[PDB]
Amino acid sequence: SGEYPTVNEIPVGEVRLYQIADGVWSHIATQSFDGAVYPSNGLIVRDGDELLLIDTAWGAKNTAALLAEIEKQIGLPVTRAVSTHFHDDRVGGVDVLRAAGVATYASPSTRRLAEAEGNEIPTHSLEGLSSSGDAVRFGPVELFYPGAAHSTDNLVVYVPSANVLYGGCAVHELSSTSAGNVADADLAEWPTSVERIQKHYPEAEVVIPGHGLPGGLDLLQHTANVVKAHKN
Ligand SMILES: C[C@@H](c1cccc2c(-c3ccc(NS(C)(=O)=O)c(C#N)c3)c(C(=O)O)[nH]c12)N1CC(CN2CC(N)C2)OC1=O
Numbered sequence: 001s002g003e004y005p006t007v008n009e010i011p012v013g014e015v016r017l018y019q020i021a022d023g024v025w026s027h028i029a030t031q032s033f034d035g036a037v038y039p040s041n042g043l044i045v046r047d048g049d050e051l052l053l054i055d056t057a058w059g060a061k062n063t064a065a066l067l068a069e070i071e072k073q074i075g076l077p078v079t080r081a082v083s084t085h086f087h088d089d090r091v092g093g094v095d096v097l098r099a100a101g102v103a104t105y106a107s108p109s110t111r112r113l114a115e116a117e118g119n120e121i122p123t124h125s126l127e128g129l130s131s132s133g134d135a136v137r138f139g140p141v142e143l144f145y146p147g148a149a150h151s152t153d154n155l156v157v158y159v160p161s162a163n164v165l166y167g168g169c170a171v172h173e174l175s176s177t178s179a180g181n182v183a184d185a186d187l188a189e190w191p192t193s194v195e196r197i198q199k200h201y202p203e204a205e206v207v208i209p210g211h212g213l214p215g216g217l218d219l220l221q222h223t224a225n226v227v228k229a230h231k232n
């Protein structure tokens with residue numbers, strides 16, 4: 001009923017959208033992994049009379065449900081998708097997207113890691129993102145590679161029209177007391193990568209984490225704090 005939806009509010013398989021700004025939504029779904037249930041976010045950005053999708057809904061059936069929810073709530077076609085790192089909460093569902101006419105994209109680093117891991121593989125490679133601090137335009141967003149953080153390949157996404165910063169899994173929500181799933185993380189580089197985000201997007205008004213509640217710029221500093229403390 002208007003609040004940002006949370007893990008116990010979304011059955012696995014269902015997707016909800018949340019309006020972030022004009023022409024910007026997050027998508028929220030939940031998924032089981034190693035016997036626990038987790039929420040995760042993605043982004044939807046209006047791209048004229050089309051939509052740009054950022055990240056899958058973490059699984060094939062969740063991603064099919066995402067497409068259906070988009071049709072119900074928005075009614076514009078998803079034509080392109082970008083996955084912001086190689087984990088299943090970002091690429092799981094790419095095959096569903098690819099069969100629904102969506103052109104799927106990721107950095108070459110993400111594509112190589114997804115392939116090596118046995119995850120679904122976006123079709124198209126996003127060049128121009130291989131060095132930390134790199135940025136490229138992609139429809140109505142800017143893609144930014146901040147450096148290694150949650151993963152070595154993690155990208156963040158900025159929506160300049162709305163000053164929305166989608167941090168993906170390099171950014172945690174304010175209630176986070178732990179650094180999430182750090183299996184593929186670089187805890188030493190993560191604060192430096194967050195500092196790069198902070199420097200590059202000082203006008204961000206909404207910051208969306210990969211999992212959990214959006215907030216403001218403080219999510220960035222909080223993330224750096226939690227990651228440093230976890231490493232400690
Ligand atoms: C697919 C993905 C993955 C799965 C499950 C949980 C998470 C998490 C995660 C954790 C705790 C969390 N909150 S809470 C109160 O502590 O429980 C929250 C939240 N809110 C999120 C994140 C994240 O933090 O982004 N991502 C996850 N995976 C898999 C993986 C490495 N696996 C070994 C193989 N190489 C694949 O690495 C990763 O990220």
Ligand SMILES: [Zn+2]
Pocket residue numbers: 085087089150151169
């Ligand atoms: Zn991840």
Ligand SMILES: [Zn+2]
Pocket residue numbers: 040087089169210211
């Ligand atoms: Zn994640």
